[PDB]
């Protein structure tokens, strides 16, 4: 009795929806970041009694991250020089140094320079992963991506790199968050919080494994889609980093070619020829794979688990790919994953041979090509691997077979934004109460 309509504003209630997210980050360096002006500082509030649903496979911010990264790379490459005139027929025998089978470029070509009436027989070095033989006489060669796309040299000073980025919601939207220690990226979290901005997310580019990542709270977490037993990619998140080290011992000599633009070829290789390689702590890798197998055979309880190397595809998926400095690696991982398990600290080091190339097809798809300028001197690198991008083979009876994959770059960042979710605040609500309004 005597209950009347009343309305409230600023109510704590929300609904899920997709929206644009902000770009905010710390003070800009190098004159992955092109964003101005802001200085974020997040604060987290643990919400009592808040039970909320989550889903890593459906959240829109992964797609926004993907588009933002692609657009940022495009804007990075927008002012840089284009290597179109280099497409002319190369003449190549190239047996100068001790090892030419490794590189095989030592190639000459007629470039037009600075007058449009004079041509000069320059010559430079190239890895024959970047070079494809022309039909007929086997001494004629050509750049690999010229007949399919244009090639842009990366600007040497603009060194886009995994700089941390914070994604902030706009006013009227709140980024929810979950810190349940045993969350597989989907299902309800009864331990929820909110923040203005995400942590310093790094846009790392790698295949067969994701590095410089975060580490789980409990033991190793195995996140996967659960619509069907048939799955595209199974993400495994480590709780204990394993250190990977890599190096390129040779001393490379940069050279400039005038095609005020300039083209930065490899002038000469100094020092005796040694193929690039990387190191892994053998005992740590054994223990990590054993724990991964023990965790993984809970989902698949009555079958053996065997790890084997990938099959087919491009170099981006057949070998572990990544970047250190201004060079790109493609490291044979066959010796690592060749393991099997039954169904029932740094004493030794594994070494893996590895190859580098310059003409990088754009990682998502082919049609636009990047050319990496050579990094002079010798290179060393250290990084922390934190997760595995596995994918299983179906159609095999009484034996599972998980093998590395992950060519689709989106899985790298979907493995990180499982925490977050964006909701739209719905501040207005009604209720019954005692009332009067004088008339």
């Amino acid at each position: 009795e005597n209950l009347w309509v009343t309305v409230y504003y600023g109510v704590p209630v929300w609904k899920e929806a997709k929206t644009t997210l902000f770009c905010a980050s710390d003070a800009k360096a190098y004159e992955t970041h092109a964003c101005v002006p802001t200085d974020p500082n997040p604060q987290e509030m643990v919400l009592k009694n808040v039970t909320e649903n989550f889903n890593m496979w459906k959240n829109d911010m992964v797609d926004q991250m993907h588009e933002d990264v692609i657009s940022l790379w495009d804007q990075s490459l927008k002012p840089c020089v284009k290597l179109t005139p280099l497409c002319v027929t190369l003449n190549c025998t190239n047996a100068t140094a001790s090892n030419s089978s490794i590189i095989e470029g030592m190639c000459s070509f007629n470039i037009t320079t600075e007058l449009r009436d004079k041509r000069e027989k320059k010559n430079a070095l190239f890895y024959k992963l970047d070079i494809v033989q022309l039909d007929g006489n086997s001494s004629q060669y050509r750049l690999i991506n010229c007949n399919t796309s244009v090639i842009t040299q990366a600007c040497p000073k603009v060194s886009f790199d995994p700089i941390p980025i914070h994604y902030c919601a706009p006013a009227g939207y709140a980024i929810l968050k979950c810190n349940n220690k045993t969350f597989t990226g989907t299902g309800p979290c009864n331990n929820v919080s909110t923040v203005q901005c995400t942590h310093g997310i790094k846009p790392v580019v790698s295949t067969q494994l994701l590095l410089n990542g975060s580490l789980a709270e409990g033991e190793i977490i195995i996140r996967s889609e659960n619509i069907t037993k048939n799955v595209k990619t199974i993400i495994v998140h480590l709780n204990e980093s394993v250190k990977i080290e890599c190096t390129r011992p040779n001393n490379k000599t940069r050279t400039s070619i005038r095609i005020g633009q300039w083209f930065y070829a490899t002038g000469q290789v100094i020092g005796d020829i040694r193929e690039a390689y990387c190191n892994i702590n053998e005992s740590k890798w054994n223990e990590t794979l054993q724990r991964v197998s023990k965790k993984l055979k809970e989902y698949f309880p009555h079958k053996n688990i065997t790890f084997q190397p990938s099959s087919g595809g491009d170099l981006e998926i057949t070998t572990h790919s990544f970047n250190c400095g201004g060079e790109f690696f493609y490291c044979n991982t066959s010796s690592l994953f060749n393991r099997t398990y039954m169904a029932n600290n740094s004493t030794r080091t594994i070494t893996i041979h590895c190859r580098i190339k310059q003409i990088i097809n754009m990682w998502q798809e082919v049609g636009r090509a990047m050319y990496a300028p050579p990094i002079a001197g010798n290179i060393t690198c250290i990084s922390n691997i934190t997760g595995l991008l596995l994918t299983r083979d179906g159609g095999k009876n009484n034996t599972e077979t998980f093998r590395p994959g992950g060519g689709n770059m989106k899985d790298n960042w979907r493995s990180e934004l499982y925490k977050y979710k964006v909701v739209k605040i719905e501040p207005l609500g009604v209720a019954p109460t005692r009332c009067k309004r004088r008339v």
Partner: antibody, heavy 122, light 107 residues
Framework: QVRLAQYGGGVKRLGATMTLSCVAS????????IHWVRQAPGQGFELLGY????????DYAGALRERLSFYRDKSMETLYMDLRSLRYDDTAMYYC???????????????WGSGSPVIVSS | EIVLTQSPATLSASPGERVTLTCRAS??????VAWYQHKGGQSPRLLIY???TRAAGVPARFSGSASGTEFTLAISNLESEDFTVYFC????????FGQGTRVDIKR
Amino acid sequence: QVRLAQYGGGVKRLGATMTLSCVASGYTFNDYYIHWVRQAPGQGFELLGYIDPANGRPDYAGALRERLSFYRDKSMETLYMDLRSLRYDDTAMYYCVRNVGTAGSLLHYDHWGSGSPVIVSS
Amino acid sequence: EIVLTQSPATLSASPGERVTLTCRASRSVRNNVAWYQHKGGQSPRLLIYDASTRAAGVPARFSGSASGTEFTLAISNLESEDFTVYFCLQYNNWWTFGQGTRVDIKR
């Protein structure tokens, strides 16, 4: 709109290698996996394997892992398959078929190709 | 593993009748099942891409329902064109097909 044309077929001699093909058309090439199914006469359909078009990752059936081999060509939007050492019971007509792949799982076929009959006999 | 034992081999129905088909899975396949219409050698067509959800462009007379491990496709107004071969599919595992059921003219 989408059409999956096929080429190759006819008679292939016993013990010889063969190479079918496919050509995508009215859709984004990278977004849909391609599968190769076959039907021997007097048998139900069965799957051989599937090839991701973007990164080229294949995956074959258990009984035919040695013989099969899948590869593509992104620029022409073309796919292939090679079945080495044809046996007599390879007499079958082979479809290429698309599937609707979600963000984290694969699902049913939607659009089937025109198919390529293959007769193994010398 | 999964053996979709589609049955019966041949269904007989007069034109205009209602008719039903069955696709017995050997074990659990969740809701991951689809049905197709085979033709005179031409490309098969998608009818239902779950146990019940009809596909785009399909005539409304085609309908399906789940029964756990057993699945069903039902045609309400059996026209002359529908007298053809239908096979069932499952995509919960490695992917298997049924033997195909023919729908012929009753007499």
